[PDB]
Coordinates of N, CA, C and O in Angstrom, one line a residue:
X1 N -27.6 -24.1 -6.7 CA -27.0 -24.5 -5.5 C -26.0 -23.4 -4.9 O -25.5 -22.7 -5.7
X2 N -25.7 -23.2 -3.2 CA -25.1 -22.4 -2.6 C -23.6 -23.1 -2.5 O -22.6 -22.5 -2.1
X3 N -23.7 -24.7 -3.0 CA -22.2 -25.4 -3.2 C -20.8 -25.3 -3.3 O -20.3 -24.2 -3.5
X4 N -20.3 -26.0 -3.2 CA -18.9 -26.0 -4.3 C -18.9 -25.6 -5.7 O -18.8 -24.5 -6.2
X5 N -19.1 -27.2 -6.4 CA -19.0 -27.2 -7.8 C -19.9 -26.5 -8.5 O -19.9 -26.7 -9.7
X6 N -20.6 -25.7 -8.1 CA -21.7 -24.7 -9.2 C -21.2 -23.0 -9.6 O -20.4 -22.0 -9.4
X7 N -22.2 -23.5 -10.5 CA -22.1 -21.6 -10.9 C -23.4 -21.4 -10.6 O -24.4 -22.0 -10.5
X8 N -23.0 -19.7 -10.2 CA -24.0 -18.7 -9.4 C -23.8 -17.9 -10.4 O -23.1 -18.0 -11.4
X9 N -25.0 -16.6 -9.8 CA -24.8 -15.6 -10.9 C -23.5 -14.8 -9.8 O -23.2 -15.1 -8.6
X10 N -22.9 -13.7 -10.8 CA -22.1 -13.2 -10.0 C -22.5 -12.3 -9.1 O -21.7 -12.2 -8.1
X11 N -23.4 -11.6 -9.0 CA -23.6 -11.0 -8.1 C -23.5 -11.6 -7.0 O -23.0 -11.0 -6.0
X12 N -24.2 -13.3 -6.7 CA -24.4 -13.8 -6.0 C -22.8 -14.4 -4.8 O -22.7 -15.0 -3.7
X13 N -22.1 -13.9 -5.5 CA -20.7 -14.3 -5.3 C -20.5 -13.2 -3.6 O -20.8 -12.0 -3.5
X14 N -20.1 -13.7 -3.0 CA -19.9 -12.8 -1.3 C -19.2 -13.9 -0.5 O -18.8 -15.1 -0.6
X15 N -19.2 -12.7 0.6 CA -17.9 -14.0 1.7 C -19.0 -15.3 2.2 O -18.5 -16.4 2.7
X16 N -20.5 -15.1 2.2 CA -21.2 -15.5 2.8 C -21.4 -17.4 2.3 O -21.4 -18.4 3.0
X17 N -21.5 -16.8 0.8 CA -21.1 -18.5 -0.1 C -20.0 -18.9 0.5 O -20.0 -19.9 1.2
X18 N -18.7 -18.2 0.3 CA -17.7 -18.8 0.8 C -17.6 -19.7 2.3 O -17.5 -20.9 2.4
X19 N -17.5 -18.9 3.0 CA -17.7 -19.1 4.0 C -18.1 -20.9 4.2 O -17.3 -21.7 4.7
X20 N -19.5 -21.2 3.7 CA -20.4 -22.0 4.1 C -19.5 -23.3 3.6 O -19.1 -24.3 4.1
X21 N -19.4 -22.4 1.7 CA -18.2 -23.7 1.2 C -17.0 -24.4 1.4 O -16.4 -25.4 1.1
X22 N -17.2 -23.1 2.6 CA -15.5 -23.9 3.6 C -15.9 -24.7 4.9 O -15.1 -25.5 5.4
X23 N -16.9 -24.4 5.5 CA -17.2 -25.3 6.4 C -18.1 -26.4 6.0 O -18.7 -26.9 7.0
X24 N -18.1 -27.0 4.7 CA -19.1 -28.1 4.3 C -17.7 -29.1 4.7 O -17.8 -30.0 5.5
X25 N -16.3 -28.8 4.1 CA -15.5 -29.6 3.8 C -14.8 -30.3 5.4 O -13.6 -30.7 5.5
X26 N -15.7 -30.3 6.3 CA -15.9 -30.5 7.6 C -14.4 -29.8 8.3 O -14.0 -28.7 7.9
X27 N -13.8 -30.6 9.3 CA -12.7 -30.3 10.3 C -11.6 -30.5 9.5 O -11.7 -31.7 9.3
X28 N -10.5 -30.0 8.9 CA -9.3 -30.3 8.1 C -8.6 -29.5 8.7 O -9.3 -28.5 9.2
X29 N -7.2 -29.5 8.9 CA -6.2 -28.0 9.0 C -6.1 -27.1 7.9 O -5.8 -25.9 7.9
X30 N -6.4 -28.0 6.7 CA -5.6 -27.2 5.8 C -6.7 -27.4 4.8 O -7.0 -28.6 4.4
X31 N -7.7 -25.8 4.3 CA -8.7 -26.1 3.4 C -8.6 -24.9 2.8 O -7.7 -24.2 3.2
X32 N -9.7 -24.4 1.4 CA -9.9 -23.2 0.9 C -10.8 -23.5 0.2 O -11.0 -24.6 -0.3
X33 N -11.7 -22.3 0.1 CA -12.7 -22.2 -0.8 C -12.5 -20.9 -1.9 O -12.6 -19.7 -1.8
X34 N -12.3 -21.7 -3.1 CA -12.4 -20.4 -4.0 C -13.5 -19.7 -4.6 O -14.3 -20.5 -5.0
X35 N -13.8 -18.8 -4.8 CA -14.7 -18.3 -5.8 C -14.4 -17.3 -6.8 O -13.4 -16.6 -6.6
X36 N -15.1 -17.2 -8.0 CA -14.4 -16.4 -9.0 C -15.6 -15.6 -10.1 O -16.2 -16.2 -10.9
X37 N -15.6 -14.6 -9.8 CA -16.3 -13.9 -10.7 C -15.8 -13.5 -12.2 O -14.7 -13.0 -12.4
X38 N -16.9 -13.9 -13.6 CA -16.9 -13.7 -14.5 C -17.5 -12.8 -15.0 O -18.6 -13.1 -15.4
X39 N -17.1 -11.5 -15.2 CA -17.8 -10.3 -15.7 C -16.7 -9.6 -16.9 O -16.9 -8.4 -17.3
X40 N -15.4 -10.6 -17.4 CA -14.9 -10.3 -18.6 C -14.9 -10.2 -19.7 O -14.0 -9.9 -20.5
X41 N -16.7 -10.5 -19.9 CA -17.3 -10.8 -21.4 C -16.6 -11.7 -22.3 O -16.9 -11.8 -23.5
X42 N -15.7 -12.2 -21.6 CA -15.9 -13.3 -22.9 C -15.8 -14.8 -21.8 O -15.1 -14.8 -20.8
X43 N -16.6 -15.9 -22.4 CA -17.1 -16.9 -21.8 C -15.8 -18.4 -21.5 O -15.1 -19.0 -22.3
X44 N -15.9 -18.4 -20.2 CA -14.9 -19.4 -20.6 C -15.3 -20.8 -20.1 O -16.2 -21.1 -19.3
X45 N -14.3 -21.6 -20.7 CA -14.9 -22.9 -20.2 C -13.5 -23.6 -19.2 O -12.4 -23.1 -19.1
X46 N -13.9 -24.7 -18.7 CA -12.8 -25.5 -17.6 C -11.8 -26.3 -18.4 O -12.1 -27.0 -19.4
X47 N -10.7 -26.1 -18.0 CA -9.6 -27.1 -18.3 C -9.1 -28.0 -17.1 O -9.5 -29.2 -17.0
X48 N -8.3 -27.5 -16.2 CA -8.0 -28.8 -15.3 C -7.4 -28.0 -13.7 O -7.2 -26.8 -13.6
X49 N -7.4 -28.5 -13.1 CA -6.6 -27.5 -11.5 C -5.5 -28.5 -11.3 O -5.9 -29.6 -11.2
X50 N -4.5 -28.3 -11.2 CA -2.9 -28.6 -11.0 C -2.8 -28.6 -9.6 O -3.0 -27.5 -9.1
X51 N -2.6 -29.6 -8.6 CA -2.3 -29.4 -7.0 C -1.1 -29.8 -7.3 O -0.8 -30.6 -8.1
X52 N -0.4 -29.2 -6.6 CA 0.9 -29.5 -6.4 C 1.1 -29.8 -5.1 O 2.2 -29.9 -4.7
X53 N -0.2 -30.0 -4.1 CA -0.1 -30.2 -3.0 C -1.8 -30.5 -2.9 O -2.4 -29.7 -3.5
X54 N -2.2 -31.2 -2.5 CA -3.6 -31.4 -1.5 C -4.7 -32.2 -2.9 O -4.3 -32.9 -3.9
X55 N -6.2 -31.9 -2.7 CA -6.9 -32.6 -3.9 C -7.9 -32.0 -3.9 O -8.0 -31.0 -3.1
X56 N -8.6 -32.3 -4.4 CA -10.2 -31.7 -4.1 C -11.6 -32.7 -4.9 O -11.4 -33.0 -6.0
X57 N -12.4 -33.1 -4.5 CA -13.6 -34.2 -5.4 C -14.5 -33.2 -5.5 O -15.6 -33.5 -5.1
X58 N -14.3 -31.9 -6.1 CA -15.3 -31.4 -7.2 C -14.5 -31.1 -8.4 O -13.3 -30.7 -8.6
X59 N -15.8 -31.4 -9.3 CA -15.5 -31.2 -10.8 C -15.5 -30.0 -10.9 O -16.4 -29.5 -10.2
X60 N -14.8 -29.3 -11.5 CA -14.2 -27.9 -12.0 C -15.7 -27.3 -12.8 O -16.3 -28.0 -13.6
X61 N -16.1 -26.1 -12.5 CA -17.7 -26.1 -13.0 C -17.2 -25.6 -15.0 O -16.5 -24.7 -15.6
X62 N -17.8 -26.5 -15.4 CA -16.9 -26.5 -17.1 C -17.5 -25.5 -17.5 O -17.2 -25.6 -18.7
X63 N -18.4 -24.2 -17.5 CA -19.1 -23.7 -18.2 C -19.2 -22.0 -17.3 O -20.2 -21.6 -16.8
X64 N -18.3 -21.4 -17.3 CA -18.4 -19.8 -16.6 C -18.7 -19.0 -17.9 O -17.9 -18.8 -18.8
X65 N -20.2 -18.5 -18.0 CA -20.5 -17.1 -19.0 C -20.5 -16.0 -18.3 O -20.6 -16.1 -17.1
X66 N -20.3 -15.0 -18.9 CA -19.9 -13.8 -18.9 C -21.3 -13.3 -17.4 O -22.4 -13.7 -17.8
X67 N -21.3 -12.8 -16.5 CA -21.6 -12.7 -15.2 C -22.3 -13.6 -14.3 O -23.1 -13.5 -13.4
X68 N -21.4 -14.8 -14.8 CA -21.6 -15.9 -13.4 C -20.1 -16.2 -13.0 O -19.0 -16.2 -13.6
X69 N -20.5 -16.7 -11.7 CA -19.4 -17.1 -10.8 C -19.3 -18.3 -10.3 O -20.3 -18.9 -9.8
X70 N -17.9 -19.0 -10.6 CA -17.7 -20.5 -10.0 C -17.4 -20.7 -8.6 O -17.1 -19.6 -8.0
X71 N -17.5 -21.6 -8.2 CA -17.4 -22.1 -7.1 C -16.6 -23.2 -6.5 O -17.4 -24.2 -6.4
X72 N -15.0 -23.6 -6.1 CA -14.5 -24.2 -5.9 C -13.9 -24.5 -4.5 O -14.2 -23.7 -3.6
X73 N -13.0 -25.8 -4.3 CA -12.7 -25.6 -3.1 C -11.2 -26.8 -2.9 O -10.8 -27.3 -3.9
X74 N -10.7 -27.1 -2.1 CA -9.4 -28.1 -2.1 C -9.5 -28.1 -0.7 O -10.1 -27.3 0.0
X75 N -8.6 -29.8 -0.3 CA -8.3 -29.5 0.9 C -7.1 -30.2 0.9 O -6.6 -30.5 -0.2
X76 N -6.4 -30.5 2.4 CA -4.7 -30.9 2.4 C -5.3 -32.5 2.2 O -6.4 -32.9 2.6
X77 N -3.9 -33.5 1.2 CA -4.0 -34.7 1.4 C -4.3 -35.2 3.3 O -4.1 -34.6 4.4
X78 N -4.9 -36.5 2.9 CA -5.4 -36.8 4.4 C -4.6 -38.1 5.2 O -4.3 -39.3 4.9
X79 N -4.4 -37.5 5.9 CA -3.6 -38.2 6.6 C -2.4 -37.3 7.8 O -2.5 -36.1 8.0
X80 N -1.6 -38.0 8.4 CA -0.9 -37.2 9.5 C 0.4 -35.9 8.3 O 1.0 -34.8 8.5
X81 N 0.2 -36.7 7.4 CA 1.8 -35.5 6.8 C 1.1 -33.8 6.5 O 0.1 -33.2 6.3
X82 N 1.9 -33.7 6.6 CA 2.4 -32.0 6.7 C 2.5 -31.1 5.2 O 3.5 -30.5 4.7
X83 N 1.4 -31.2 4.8 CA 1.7 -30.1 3.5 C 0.3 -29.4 3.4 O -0.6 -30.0 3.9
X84 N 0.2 -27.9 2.5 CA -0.8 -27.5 2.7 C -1.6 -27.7 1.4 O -1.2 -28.6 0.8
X85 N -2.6 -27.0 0.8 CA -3.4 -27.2 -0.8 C -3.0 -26.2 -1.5 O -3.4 -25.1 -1.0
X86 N -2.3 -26.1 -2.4 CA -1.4 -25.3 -3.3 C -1.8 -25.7 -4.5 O -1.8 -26.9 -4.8
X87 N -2.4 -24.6 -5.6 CA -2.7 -25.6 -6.6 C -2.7 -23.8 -8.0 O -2.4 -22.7 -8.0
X88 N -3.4 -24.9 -9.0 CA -3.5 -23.9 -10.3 C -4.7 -24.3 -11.0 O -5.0 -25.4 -11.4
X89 N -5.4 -23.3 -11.0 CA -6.8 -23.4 -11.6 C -6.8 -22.9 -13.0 O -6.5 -21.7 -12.9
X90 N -7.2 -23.5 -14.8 CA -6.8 -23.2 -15.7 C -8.0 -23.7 -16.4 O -8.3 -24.8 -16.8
X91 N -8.9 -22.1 -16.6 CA -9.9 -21.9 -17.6 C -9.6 -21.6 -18.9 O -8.9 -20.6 -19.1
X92 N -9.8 -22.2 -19.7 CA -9.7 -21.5 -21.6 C -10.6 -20.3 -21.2 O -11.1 -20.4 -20.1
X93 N -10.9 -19.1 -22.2 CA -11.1 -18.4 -22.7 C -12.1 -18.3 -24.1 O -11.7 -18.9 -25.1
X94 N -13.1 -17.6 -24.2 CA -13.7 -17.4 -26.0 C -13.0 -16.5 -26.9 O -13.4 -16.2 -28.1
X95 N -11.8 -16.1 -26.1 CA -10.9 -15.3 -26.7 C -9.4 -16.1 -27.2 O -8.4 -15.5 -27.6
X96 N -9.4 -17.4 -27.1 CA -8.4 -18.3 -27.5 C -7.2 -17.9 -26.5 O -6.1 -18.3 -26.9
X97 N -7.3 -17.1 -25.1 CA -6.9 -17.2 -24.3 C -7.0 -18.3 -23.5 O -7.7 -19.3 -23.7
X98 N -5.7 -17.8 -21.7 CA -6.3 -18.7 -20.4 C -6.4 -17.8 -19.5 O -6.1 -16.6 -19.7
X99 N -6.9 -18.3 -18.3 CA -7.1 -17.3 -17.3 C -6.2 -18.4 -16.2 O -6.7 -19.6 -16.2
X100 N -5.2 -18.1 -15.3 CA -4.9 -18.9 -14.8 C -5.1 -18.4 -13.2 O -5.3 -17.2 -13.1
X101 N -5.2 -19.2 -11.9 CA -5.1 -18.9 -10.6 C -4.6 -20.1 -9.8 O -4.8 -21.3 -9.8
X102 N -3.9 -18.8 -9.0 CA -2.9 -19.7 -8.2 C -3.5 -19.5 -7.0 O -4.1 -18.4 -6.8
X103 N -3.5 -20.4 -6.2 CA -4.0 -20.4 -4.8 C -2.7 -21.6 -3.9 O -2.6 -22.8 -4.0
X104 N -1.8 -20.7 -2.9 CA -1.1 -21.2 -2.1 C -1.4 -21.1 -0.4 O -1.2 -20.0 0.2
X105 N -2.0 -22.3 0.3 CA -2.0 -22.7 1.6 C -0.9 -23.1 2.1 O -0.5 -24.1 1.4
X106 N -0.1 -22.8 3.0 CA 0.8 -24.0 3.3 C 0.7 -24.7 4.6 O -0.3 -24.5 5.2
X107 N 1.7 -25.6 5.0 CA 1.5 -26.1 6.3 C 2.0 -25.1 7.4 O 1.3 -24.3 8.0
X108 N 3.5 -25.2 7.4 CA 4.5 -24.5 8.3 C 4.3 -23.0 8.2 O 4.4 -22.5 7.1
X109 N 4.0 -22.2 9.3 CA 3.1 -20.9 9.0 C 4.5 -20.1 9.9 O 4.4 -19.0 10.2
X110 N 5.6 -20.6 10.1 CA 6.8 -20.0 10.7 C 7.2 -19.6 9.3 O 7.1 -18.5 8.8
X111 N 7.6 -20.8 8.6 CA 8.3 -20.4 7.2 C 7.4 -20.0 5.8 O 7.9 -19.5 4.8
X112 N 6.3 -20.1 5.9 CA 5.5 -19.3 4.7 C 4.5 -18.6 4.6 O 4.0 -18.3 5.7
X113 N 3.9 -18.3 3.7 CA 2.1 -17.2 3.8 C 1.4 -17.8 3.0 O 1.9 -18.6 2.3
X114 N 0.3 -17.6 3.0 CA -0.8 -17.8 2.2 C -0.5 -16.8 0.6 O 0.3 -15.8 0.4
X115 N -1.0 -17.3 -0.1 CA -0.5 -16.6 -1.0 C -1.4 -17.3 -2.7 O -1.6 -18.4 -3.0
X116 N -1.7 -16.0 -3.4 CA -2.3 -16.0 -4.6 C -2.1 -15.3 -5.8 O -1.4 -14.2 -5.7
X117 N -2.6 -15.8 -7.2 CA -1.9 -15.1 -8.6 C -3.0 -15.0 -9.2 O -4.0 -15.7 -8.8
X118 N -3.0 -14.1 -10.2 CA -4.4 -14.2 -11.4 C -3.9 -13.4 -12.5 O -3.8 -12.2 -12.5
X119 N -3.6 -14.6 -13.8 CA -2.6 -13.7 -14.7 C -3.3 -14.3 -15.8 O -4.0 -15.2 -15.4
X120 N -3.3 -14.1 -17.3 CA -3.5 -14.5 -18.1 C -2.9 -15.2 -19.2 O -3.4 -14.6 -20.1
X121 N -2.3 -15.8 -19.7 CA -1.8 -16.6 -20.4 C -2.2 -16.8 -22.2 O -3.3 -17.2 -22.5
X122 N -1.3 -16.4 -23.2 CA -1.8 -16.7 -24.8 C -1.9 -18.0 -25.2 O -0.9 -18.7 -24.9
X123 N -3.0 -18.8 -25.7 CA -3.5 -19.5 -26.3 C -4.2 -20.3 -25.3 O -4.7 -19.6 -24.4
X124 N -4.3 -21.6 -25.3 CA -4.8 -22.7 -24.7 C -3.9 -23.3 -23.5 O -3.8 -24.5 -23.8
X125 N -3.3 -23.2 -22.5 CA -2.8 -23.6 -21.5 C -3.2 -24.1 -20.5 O -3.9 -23.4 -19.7
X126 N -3.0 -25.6 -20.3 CA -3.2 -26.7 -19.0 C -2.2 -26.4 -18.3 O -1.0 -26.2 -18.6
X127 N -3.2 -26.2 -16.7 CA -2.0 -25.8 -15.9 C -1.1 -27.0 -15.6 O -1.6 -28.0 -16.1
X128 N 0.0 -27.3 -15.1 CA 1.1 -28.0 -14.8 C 2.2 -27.1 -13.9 O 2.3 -25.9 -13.9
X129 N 2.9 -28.2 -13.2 CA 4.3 -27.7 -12.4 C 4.3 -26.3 -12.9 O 3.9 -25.3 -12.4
X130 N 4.9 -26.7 -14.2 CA 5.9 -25.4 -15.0 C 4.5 -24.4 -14.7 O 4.8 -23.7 -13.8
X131 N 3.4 -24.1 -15.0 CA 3.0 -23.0 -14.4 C 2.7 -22.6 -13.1 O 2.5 -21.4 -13.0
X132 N 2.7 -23.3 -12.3 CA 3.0 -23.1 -10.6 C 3.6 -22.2 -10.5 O 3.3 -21.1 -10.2
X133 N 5.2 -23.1 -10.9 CA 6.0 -22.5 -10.9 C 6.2 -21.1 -11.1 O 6.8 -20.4 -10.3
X134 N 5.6 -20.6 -12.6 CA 5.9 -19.2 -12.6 C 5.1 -18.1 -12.0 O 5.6 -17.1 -11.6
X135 N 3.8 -18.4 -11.9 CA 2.9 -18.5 -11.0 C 3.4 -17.8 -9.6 O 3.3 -16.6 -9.1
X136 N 3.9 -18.9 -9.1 CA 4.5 -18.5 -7.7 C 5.6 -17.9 -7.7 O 5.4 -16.7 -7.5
X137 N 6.8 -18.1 -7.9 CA 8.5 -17.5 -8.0 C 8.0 -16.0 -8.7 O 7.4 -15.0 -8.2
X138 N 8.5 -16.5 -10.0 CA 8.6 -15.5 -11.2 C 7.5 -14.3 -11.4 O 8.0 -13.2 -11.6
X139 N 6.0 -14.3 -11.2 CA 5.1 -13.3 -11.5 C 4.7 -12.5 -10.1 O 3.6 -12.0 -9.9
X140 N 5.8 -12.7 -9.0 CA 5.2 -11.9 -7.8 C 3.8 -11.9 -7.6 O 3.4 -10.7 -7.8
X141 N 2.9 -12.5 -7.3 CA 1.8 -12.8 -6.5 C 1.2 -12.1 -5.1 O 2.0 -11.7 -4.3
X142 N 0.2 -11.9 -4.8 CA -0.2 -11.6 -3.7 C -0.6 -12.4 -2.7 O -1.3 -13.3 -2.8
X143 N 0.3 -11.7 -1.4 CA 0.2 -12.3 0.1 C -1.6 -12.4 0.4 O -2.4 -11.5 0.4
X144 N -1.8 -13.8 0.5 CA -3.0 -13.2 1.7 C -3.0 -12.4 2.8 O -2.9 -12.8 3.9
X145 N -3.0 -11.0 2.5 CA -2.5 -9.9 3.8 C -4.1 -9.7 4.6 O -4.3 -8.8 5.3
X146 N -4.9 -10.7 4.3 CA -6.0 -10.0 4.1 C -6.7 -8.5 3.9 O -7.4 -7.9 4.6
X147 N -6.2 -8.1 2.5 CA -6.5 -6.7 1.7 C -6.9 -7.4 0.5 O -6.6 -8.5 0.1
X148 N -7.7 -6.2 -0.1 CA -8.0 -6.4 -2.0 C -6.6 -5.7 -2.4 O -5.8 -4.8 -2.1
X149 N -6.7 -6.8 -3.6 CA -5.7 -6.2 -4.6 C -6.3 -6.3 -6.0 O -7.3 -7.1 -6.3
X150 N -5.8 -5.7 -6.8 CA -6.0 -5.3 -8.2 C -5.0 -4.9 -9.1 O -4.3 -3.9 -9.0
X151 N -5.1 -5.9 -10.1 CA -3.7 -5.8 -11.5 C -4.4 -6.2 -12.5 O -5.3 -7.1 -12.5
X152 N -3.6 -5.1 -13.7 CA -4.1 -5.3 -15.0 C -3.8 -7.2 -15.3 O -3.1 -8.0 -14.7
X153 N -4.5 -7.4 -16.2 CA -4.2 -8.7 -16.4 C -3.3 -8.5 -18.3 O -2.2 -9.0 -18.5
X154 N -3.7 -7.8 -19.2 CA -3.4 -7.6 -20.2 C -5.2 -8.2 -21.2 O -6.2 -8.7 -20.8
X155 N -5.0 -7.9 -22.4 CA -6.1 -8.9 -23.2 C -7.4 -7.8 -22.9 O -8.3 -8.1 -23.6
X156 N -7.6 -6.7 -22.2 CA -8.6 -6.3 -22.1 C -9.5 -6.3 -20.8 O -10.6 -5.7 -20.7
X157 N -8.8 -7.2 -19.8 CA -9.1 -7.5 -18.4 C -7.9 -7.1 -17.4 O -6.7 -7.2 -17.4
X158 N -8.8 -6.7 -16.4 CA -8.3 -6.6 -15.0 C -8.7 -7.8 -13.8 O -9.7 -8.6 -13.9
X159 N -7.9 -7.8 -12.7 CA -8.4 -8.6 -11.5 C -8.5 -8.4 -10.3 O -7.5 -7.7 -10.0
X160 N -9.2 -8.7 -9.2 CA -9.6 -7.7 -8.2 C -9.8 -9.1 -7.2 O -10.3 -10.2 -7.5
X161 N -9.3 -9.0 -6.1 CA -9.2 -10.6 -5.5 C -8.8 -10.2 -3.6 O -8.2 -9.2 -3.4
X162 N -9.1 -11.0 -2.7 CA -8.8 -10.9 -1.1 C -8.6 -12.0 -1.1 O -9.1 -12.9 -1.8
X163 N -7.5 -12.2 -0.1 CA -7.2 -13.8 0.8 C -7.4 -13.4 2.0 O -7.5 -12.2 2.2
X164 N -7.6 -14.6 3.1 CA -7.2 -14.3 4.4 C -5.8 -14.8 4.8 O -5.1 -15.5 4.1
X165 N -5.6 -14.6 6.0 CA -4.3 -15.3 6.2 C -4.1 -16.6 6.8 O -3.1 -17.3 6.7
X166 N -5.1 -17.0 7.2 CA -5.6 -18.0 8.2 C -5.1 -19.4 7.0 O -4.7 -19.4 5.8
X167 N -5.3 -20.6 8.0 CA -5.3 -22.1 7.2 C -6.4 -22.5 6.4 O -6.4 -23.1 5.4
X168 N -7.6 -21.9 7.1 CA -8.9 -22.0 6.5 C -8.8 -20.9 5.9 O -8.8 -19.8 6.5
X169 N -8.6 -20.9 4.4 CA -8.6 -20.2 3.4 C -9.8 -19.5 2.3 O -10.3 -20.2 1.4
X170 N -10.1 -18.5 2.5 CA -10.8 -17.6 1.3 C -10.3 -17.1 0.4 O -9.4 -16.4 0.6
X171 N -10.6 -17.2 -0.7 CA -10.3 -16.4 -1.9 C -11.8 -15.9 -2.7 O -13.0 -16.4 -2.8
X172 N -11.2 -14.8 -2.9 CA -12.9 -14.4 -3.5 C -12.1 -13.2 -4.8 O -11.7 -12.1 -4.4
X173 N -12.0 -13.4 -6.0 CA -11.5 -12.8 -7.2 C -12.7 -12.7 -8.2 O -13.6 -13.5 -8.4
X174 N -12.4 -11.1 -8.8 CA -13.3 -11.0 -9.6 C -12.6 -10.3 -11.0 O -12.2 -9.2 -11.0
X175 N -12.6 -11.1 -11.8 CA -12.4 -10.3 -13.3 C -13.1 -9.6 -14.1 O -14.1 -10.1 -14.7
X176 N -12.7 -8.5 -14.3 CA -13.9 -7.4 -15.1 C -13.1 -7.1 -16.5 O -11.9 -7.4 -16.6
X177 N -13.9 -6.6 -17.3 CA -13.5 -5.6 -18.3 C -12.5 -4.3 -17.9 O -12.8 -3.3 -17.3
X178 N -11.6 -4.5 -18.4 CA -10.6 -3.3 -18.0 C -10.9 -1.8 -18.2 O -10.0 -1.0 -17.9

């Protein structure tokens, strides 16, 4: 499938999937589509996505091998209130690592940016608050400026990732071998 909840191969991974994945989730203000390339050789599986803001009704695709790509997406709680989909996405590792990702939409575009993280974490870690948290504040993250960015991750991996700035949100990150 060209979906949400699936895995692709990674190659297959482009703005073009995204794109579509964000306009399935019909008219919302506040949406994103993520996508995530695995080319870190080692295989990881799904733990859980933390919103600290908004929800999403796809299952986390539980099974990313080493060059395929997941497919995710969130949108804002529904209704008249005012918050955007801010959340933490937290795969295990075959390395008894985590791979964590932050993805921040907000509402009020006077007072904040779009904004994203991709850091790795020792042992087994479910994301929660407390990783948001550091996540966002503490590990300086990148603006959706719409540009690539690229940071060592540590463990043997690097990460390579675009946002846009907009409400309708893209993320498109790819983890390689360092």
């Amino acid at each position: 499938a060209d979906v949400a909840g699936a895995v692709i191969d990674g190659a297959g991974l482009g703005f073009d999937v995204l794109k579509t994945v964000l306009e399935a989730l019909g008219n919302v203000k506040r949406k994103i589509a993520v996508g995530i390339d695995n080319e870190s050789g080692k295989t990881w599986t799904a733990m859980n996505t933390y919103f600290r803001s908004g929800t999403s009704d796809i299952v986390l695709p539980h099974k990313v091998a080493h060059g395929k790509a997941l497919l995710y997406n969130g949108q804002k709680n529904r209704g008249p209130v005012a918050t955007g989909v801010v959340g933490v996405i937290a795969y295990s590792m075959s390395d008894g690592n985590t791979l964590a990702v932050l993805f921040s939409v907000p509402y009020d575009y006077n007072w904040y940016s779009n904004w994203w993280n991709v850091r790795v974490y020792k042992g087994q870690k479910r994301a929660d608050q407390r990783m948001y948290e550091e996540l966002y504040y503490h590990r300086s993250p990148f603006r959706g400026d719409n540009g690539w960015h690229s940071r060592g991750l540590g463990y043997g991996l690097k990460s390579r990732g675009f946002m846009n700035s907009s409400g309708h949100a893209i993320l498109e990150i790819h983890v390689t071998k360092a």
